[PDB]
């Protein structure tokens, strides 16, 4: 079938920089390529039609050009952290590219931390999930361990990272440490992030 | 009289463009699968010009194409003789 | 001219679900509604299309003749009959309007369809109670499947809120963790996290004092 | 009168489709080697539309093609003027 | 009378050649982007011959192409019947 | 009267086939460079069918092609109306 | 609308054979009969085609102008004249109907054509006589060439029967081994293996008591 | 000429599984490809015409789709042990692919054995062909040797394996040991299969 | 039918300049003026084209919609409006006539456009005073930017003259070195090097006695 | 886009020799290729149109021929030291090749030398640029050092080479040695070229 | 331009054998290929026109078939030792292939030998060319040395081999040994072939 | 309908020769005469073509506009004017008839054209005099250029004759060696080798007794 090869998967370009995204069609698809912004969790939003034509509402920073190599070019803003998508209409059926995650780059920003002990309402029912929060940091890369009575925990340490604030372009993290209420009652002292 | 012909042609065109695109989706690699380009297709046809950018790969498509020719060639041919006489009768 | 989708949650592997896409907009004689799919952390997959006008609807050899697409023009809706489901079909499912032109001007909201043999459950919901801007949250523990809805104050509060991604507990049960960043002068202000699960018809609300 | 024309056309079409496919087998890489697609070929021809999907590579083929044009163009042209007058005479 | 037709045709031709080339520049990979070859294009068109070397990829182009057909087919068709009668009336 | 037309057509054909092949040699990659295939070319032309296998790449060629159309389309068109009337007058 | 083939067995290398394909069915004005070939343990090879109506028949540079194809429309049959044979041509030969459409709706049964200088012979046929379901069989020893036909009881018996592939004896002479699986209560039942060789006009039958 | 490259030659897929078969044309053959079942020894049976269209009588498990890559897909039954074949009709002349042997997979099944001494009618005429039978086994892989007075025979040991039962999908085997009636009279004791 | 260009010298990075191309020749209804570019020690880059007649003018995704092309038909001139300049745009800029045919029959003279944040300066101009044919020259020291014009005797002298390429002084300031080869009988003849810099409106002249 | 690949970048062919230059188009551009002479500093001068056709005024030594490989051929003169350029017109937009520098070859010719001390008008203003001239030499390759009181200078030695005389096809060179008027007053003795 | 690649250059096939010759066109030339026999020294003789059609007079052993691969096939005779040639006519201009030398193979045949001393008419004029003849041998490979007074000559030994008899398909050879009439008068004894 | 060629032998490098191709046959209105070339031990090279009817004649960039092709229709001949020759052009030169169809039905005989600065010379011609079939020959020593013609008995004898290839003597001068195989009863029979060199207008004949 017709293969839109988007290039490249990921972009770490700094804000205000110029950013470009490439859709090599397998064959001449004419000018029948369309760009789509799909923000984390929302539905796609057609950014470019017929390779170059723009839609009412889409910012002026967004333009598309050209052989079988099609391009979408950002002259870059915080709202623009998205995956960008590429759509054939030359031949049946329609086809998308793999898509390109842009990720915004900015100056380092160590996080806020808020440790959270397990709810009494929980503690009665066997486990003790302990929480530890990492607010609005940059970059992604962060290491949070657990110790108890200064004996390091690898048991049951479970991380989750958010999608970048659409203005901040920041990462918040949350690490749980689920324990047996037995292991929780034994030593009751609680996250030395790095 | 002649307005009948133009419209009647325009109608056929809109019809065949519609139908071919409808008849042509679902067939892997069908070219003739959006109205705009179905419309261009339908035109290049009834003019008996017929350039080869675009055509139906499907059967039903080609039967659309047939109706389009018979109907279109005539309904177009009507507009051609209309503008000849008009050119003739004046001069 | 927006698009409104309905149905879709958990199904037995080999089972069947029916998804909906209501007109809600000036819709023409000849729009194709399409159906597009997004697997968890994957690109998009064109699946299906349909004219309501003549009811003809082409599929993708990946959904083969496993799915059907229906068009009730009276209700101004198109549907996605879903036979023979597979673990692959685990995904989120957008419809889209395409005016015979070859791009998607409008889109449905997207619903999640989850394919598994491990049955349903509901959320535990433990408070995470709390200087300046302090933070408070609330767990939503041991769930299945992913549609999980959390706002604070029936929606009212939105700021400094980081409602986190869902983690697969080693057990097999979606628990998550909602978070808010607020000023410490507020304790003096009502804080409650509303946890809706259309799948398990839940509406849990927990109160977060220190 | 006109039914004569339509059939006579349809005949030629069935003839030329037959013949071209017959004339065209045996030639390595001949496209025009099954009646269905010979039929489409034969149509696109007599309409003087002529799209370039399909044509005879063989000599005999092209002589089939010739007969088809002369016969077809006329017998088709007959059906076109028939539906013009009918459109004309009424309106 | 007939000189009117020839010129009128020649005019249309020069017009459509001009316009298509104008309508076609700026589109990456447009073929139909120099007057000489626009002129050949414009000819192969109004003759309803239509060979497929060259055509408009642009929209505006295709609308040029349309005008060209309607105008050209007629204005050409005028010169054809002129040389038939002349052939007829003598012999 | 009509025999005049057929021959006159056949003449033009033999002429244009001759000339195009003559006009076309010397141009690297010219297709239209042997009489047989020049002849087929010349036919597909005057029928306003125009399939796109073959065409002049040269300038002079295309001017051959022009003369061929004007002359051929008419001289062919003459044979078409001849076999219509004959079909008409009898039936 | 079935197809019935005839002729074909052993030929001297450089010799000639004529194969047949009888209509036996509503057959139209314009069907091409084709000829397709299968070498021992090999794929298929399109060879030839023919309209009976006009008698024109195209070949394959592998059968070059070595073979001819004939069409007696009165007998409603098409034929395959076979000059200049080679060891390669050793194969099985199907005709097929193709209604100008480009696939083979019906097929002849297939005959075997064997090309060799080693001449004919016939079968020895030794009984293999015999708890529950016991087995009994019968050899068919030292044969040439492969068409070898074995049924039990003039055909009557068919079950548990494994009539084996033919082995090339080190000598050069097809022997095989027919087998049946039957219940031991049967000895009390008549068991005879019918070994037909149209090539060597054989009809051997052997009786298998313990 | 036009080269239908079928893929792959052999399939050992288990019954009820989904099975697919690929015919890469050398060039665009349009949609002019046809699938044919040819069962061991019988004539081909057209399964699919024009790439996707099915014929009256062919089961619903059989479907074909699609670029230059054409596919035949089995959603699999015991009757289906066959070779499958692929047929061009775009350009003269017609062409087939190499073809794909499917072979059914099932649970292990050790064989029944029936040793057979040489017929008296034979024994008079020089040789003594001794037979040994292996009924309805799975898989193919089996090893049958000959000993006589416990001295292992490699002389004149000749195997033949049947085509899989069209319901059982089982293999039966038969090994002959042709001997001089001299070597047969010397030691008259007779197949320890493995 | 020659072409006369004007404007162009130094601009702030992100600034704007307007270049000119005057008709000066039998010019037709339908000529495209094009604009071609040559980076320092680089090939040519087609940029832009325009019909004056209808005013439509296509660009290159390298000059994107960063540049505009204008056509005052009354002045019989076409222009090159230059927004959003980059260090890349540092280059020399020819217009060209193309009569709808696809080659460039005539050309403008070429002006240099220099893009930098380091501001302007002017030339020092030190004499290099001097057997047979002896040589004499004159430096033109510490300049910016490159358009630098040197003739001897208001132009009069041209022979044995090697007016050298410009070197980038480690400081950042174009100095060069004009040279003449003359006969030693001449000292008795007036020798003066005229150093014009339209950018820094200079007209320095130095006298070279031994 | 359409890629004119000219071959080769540089030519050192001797005068009167036959010289050829190749423009491989990425695809068939028809016959829509044009050759341009652009002499050092002047504007291009269209030498060939439509691959083979010549323009009024261009010498008879200049001819162009031909598949996708287009050629410009010189049967060679001193005026011809140039870069030669190659121009597509088949598809929008127009395209050039990289271009080919020809450089003329001739018999060896050691240069004239004229050392130049720093102007009094200069000497008052800090630096002392000292000059050394190399007139009408062949080949390019020349080495000029500086010594002062026979201690070799690498400090602040700055070369410039001219473009070949359009008849001589010769190279003149000029090397400056800018010094502090301090370092100039210390040792006042001045270029042993090789 | 259009490249007829003939395959292979040389054939040593035995007489009566089947022999084939391949002309891979660079692109589809339609059916516009022609085969030509050119015998050593004579002019080409068109053997096949339009790929398959034969000319009046050419033997029935000669036939040509077919994609872009064109073939000329010999089902082989002694008159057929030739080079065979391949001719495009699809596109201007016409093109040939490199051509294929066939050479006939047959049973070994040691040669006749006739040594020839230098003519008196020669001997008066300085040199003494001595000749040695090798009639109607097969194969080509032969080694002929010169000795004089049994001291082996490499000085001035000059071989020539004929083209194969058009019935015999045999090779005759002739080796000259030109000498100074001085070196000829010194030792007057004369070719031990192998 | 044969073709007769003339001219052609030795030329100075950079010189000129004119070759001829006379009709000698029913020749039509519209035949192209072509010119084909064979370098010593090389394939063929299409060079040129011409209609006599309109006199238009296309060349090969290898013979560029170095050669011209002429057509005197009155003499029914076409010619090959040969300017600017190179050592490469050393070759043999066939004309050919092609009836607008694209193959060469008839051919001229072929003449040799030799390009060199080393001038002409002539043949020495030493007898090689001589059981059964004995052999006798005759050298033809120290020649230039290659056209060398040898028959025995003004042509009469042809059998057992091996007239050898020409060798390049270390000197630079074609000598060859004619040979005949005859019966020894013949000495009693007249043996004379006729050595013609149109280039050096030779007609040497030598008598071979023992
Ligand atoms: Ba047409």
Numbering used by the authors:
A (entry chain B), H (entry chain B), J (entry chain B), K (entry chain B): 2 to 67, 69 to 77, 79 to 193, 195 to 198
B (entry chain C), D (entry chain C), E (entry chain C), F (entry chain C): 28 to 118
C (entry chain A), G (entry chain A), I (entry chain A), L (entry chain A): 5 to 134, 141 to 197, 199 to 221
Show me the paper's own sentences about this structure:
To compare the effect of the E71V mutation on the selectivity filter, the crystal structures of closed and open-gate E71V KcsA were determined in the presence of Ba2+ and in the absence of K+. In contrast to the WT KcsA, Ba2+ predominantly binds at the S3 site in both E71V structures, which is confirmed by the anomalous x-ray diffraction as shown in Fig. 4. On the other hand, the open-gate Ba2+-bound E71V structure is narrowed compared to the closed-gate Ba2+-structure. This aligns with the selectivity filter narrowing observed for the open-gate E71V KcsA crystal structure in absence of Ba2+. In addition, the open-gate E71V structures, with and without Ba2+, show the same conformational change of the W67 sidechain if compared to WT KcsA. By contrast, the filter of open-gate E71V accommodates Ba2+ at the S3 site without constriction. In open-gate E71V, Ba2+ stably binds to the selectivity filter at site S3 for 500 ns with Na+ (from the bulk solution) briefly binding to the outer sites of the selectivity filter. The selectivity filter adopts a conductive state, but notably this conformation was not stable throughout the 500 ns simulation. The G77 Cα-Cα cross-subunit distances show that the filter cross-subunit distances fluctuate between 6 and 9 Å (maximum near 400 ns) due to the conformational instability and deviation of the upper filter (Y78 to D80) in some subunits.
